[PDB]
């Protein structure tokens, strides 16, 4: 009974502390910065072969190999330079919602409405791709997964919880709880000691991988957060939400720094990613168009050419050379 | 390691992908929704912590894949986007449970007005008709108490008299059907159609009902694809 008033008081105290630190804004500080100017990106490559709507893709750390999940039940691994399909992995469940590429390139993971996360070993001696392990224990669809290491993978689920898995044993090393809605996206900090997850409760949380508790919570969005991405230095992260606004948050000021939105934009944002330097913030929309935002000036620095359907995923190579966008039209397009 | 051998590998993967697209196009995907008290868990058995169960069957040598969604959280609004572009949704409701009948109505409303299901036709199974008949014939509990409009609703002359059952049974079941058809017609434009059916969970015809409704849905889709409309 008494504890709820304590919770409200602590919430107000946190709000007051955030206000105390809000004496300036990113726009006020970047007024004089030279604008990015108009950016044109040509579709250097169109990767064709998925049967159904693509739902996720990920880059190998080599910045050349590219995994891609489609809800036809396939993971395809692409050589982005030559457009050669390196692997086609048939999945036991066709309703894939996420995929990941191991930072070593040895493993590729996927998941979806089947609440299990399947780890695939790409480096088999038999020459085929075998399910290394199926991670089970999440109650509800699995929405995102990201490898910390060959032996550790972080997953988020409609279960409203994230979990860290010891792939060797297949057991949750730790489970992250506190979200009050479906967790829809997840991103690892570059140091891999922290990750952030956005949920349908219109909030984002910062999780300590080893401690197992959420150090911070961000609530600027008005609607479900569909996408989240760390700033390349790991001090800030962008979020994409159904409310058509992207937002930048700082882990140290513990509050929203900037909103990226336009009155002509009403579609929800499906994906977000920074460029290598962090000056560009790319976002995909239900409108069939990825918009490039000046991460500092908030200006709509450009717009990636049309997809034929909702842009579902995008990601920037680890070297920053190119942007890959997937969409429900079954094509990945590479922009540079 | 010549690049030409990698191109050969890519071409073999392309061949396999075409071989799989042939299977993908030649199957009809169906989403089986409905509350837990509905007979949907029983309807699947009459067809011939995991999160999804693909039932599979065929009628007249067309293959149906019916995906029952289980162990998912109650909030449908997110994972439902995956099922855009299914051929139909099969929505099952326990017609006899007047207490939860309004919740079934609200669930049907939310599915029908969904942003992403805007072009998906709903095959509506008004299930457990035998229990409805037994309820209305016993009279101990009456839909009158839950839906005041039933006190004045009267069976239309267009109603099918085939069963020859008690007139109260027909009146109650047709009022229940109208309760869903009203939502369908009010919100539904010409994009998608609702196909109500009175069914028992133990009923061999449900597969044929699904086949007929899917045939009508595919006919309606072709009518637009081929510019006839």
């Amino acid at each position, epitope marked *: 009974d008494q504890l709820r008033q304590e919770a409200e008081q602590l919430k107000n105290q946190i709000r007051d502390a955030r206000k105390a630190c809000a004496d300036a804004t990113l726009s006020q500080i970047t007024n004089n910065i030279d604008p990015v100017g108009r950016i044109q990106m040509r579709t250097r490559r169109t990767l064709r072969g998925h049967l159904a709507k693509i739902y996720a893709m990920h880059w190998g750390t080599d910045s*050349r*190999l590219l995994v891609s999940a489609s809800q036809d039940g396939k993971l395809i691994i692409w*050589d982005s330079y*030559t457009t*050669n399909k*390196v*692997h086609a992995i048939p999945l036991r469940s066709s309703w894939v919602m996420t995929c990941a590429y191991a930072p070593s*390139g040895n493993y590729v993971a996927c998941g979806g409405l089947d609440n299990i996360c399947s780890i695939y070993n790409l*480096k088999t*001696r*038999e*020459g*085929n791709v075998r399910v290394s392990r199926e991670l089970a224990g999440h109650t509800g669809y699995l929405s995102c997964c990201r490898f910390l290491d060959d032996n550790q993978i972080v997953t988020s689920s409609g279960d409203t919880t994230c979990a860290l898995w010891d792939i060797e044993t297949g057991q949750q090393t730790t489970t992250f709880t506190g979200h009050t809605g479906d967790v829809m996206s997840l991103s690892l900090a570059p140091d891999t000691r922290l990750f952030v997850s956005g949920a349908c409760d219109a909030s984002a949380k910062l999780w300590d991988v080893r401690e197992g508790m959420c150090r911070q919570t961000f609530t600027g969005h008005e609607s479900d957060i569909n996408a989240i991405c760390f700033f390349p230095n790991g001090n800030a992260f962008a979020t994409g939400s159904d409310d058509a606004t992207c937002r930048l948050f700082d882990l140290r000021a513990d509050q929203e720094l900037m909103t990226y939105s336009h009155d002509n934009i009403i579609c929800g944002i499906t994906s977000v990613s920074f460029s290598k330097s962090g000056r560009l913030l790319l976002a995909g929309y239900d409108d069939f168009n990825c918009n490039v935002w000046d991460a500092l000036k908030a200006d709509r620095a450009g717009v990636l050419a049309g997809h034929d359907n909702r842009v579902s995923c995008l990601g920037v190579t680890d070297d920053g050379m190119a942007v890959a966008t997937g969409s429900w039209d079954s094509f990945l397009k590479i922009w540079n | *390691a*010549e*690049d*030409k*051998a*990698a191109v*050969e*590998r890519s*071409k*073999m993967i392309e061949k396999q992908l075409q071989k799989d697209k042939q299977v993908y196009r030649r199957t009809l995907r169906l989403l089986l929704l409905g509350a837990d008290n509905s007979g949907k868990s029983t309807i699947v058995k009459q067809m011939r912590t995991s999160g999804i169960f693909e039932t599979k069957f065929q009628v007249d040598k067309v293959n149906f894949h019916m995906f029952d969604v289980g162990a998912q959280r109650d909030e449908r609004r997110k994972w439902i986007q995956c099922f855009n572009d299914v051929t139909a949704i099969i929505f099952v409701v326990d017609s006899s449970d007047y207490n939860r009948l309004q919740e079934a109505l609200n669930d049907f409303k939310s599915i029908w007005n969904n942003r992403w299901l805007r072009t998906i036709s709903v095959i509506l199974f008004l299930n457990k008709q035998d229990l409805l008949a037994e309820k209305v014939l016993a009279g101990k509990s009456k839909i009158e108490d839950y839906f005041p409009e039933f006190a004045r609703y009267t069976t239309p002359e267009d109603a099918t008299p085939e069963p020859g059952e008690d007139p109260r049974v027909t009146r109650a079941k047709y009022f229940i059907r109208k309760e869903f058809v009203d939502i369908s017609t009010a919100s539904g434009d010409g994009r998608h159609i609702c196909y109500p059916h009175f069914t028992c969970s133990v009923d061999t015809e449900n597969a044929r009902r699904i086949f007929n409704d899917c045939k009508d849905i595919i006919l309606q889709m072709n009518l637009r694809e081929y510019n006839l409309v």
Partner: single-chain antibody
Amino acid sequence: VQLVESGGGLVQPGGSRKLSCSASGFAFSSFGMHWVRQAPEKGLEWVAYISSGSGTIYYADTVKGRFTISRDDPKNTLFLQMTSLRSEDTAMYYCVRSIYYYGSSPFDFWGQGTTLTVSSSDIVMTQATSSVPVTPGESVSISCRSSKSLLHSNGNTYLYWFLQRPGQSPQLLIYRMSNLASGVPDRFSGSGSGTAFTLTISRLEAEDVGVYYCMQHLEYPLTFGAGTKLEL
């Protein structure tokens, strides 16, 4: 994983013979396959290649027309059909798998081979040092050169290094100028300028004793070096 060649024996000149190579424990259908000849006490010699799905077939001019390579994917069996045997054809024939995609390691497994006894513009590979006396713990180096530069425009240097221990089939050591193969210890290292290449063993051990063969894969026919025999 195993490859087991069968057939061979003694056949009179001008005769015909069929070699069989039974594959088990790996996805045979997805691998390209090679036949590699080794005349008695001589170096390796690529015979024929058949790609996965039989899309591509290549032969060395020494055997073109005379030999025919075929595979039966459902039976995980590879065949070499030899119609007109010669004295030149006497050799141990190895069955070798090769899977080609970005970052693959072709030639990673060799069968134990079968012995057959009988009563022009391609790239020349050379290993001037036929043998090297060496002792354990030494930082050995084995040199190689090619008549044509193996560094392709795409950045790959298509040089391979194989170790053949006495009485054993060749083992892949390095599957691209620098790329150390799987199951090979860190002792071995590869480097080169795109026309001259070196294999380094940091601290030789008794198990490293054998003949080291370089091979080019820039274009067919695949040509091996004469080999360098380490001994102690």
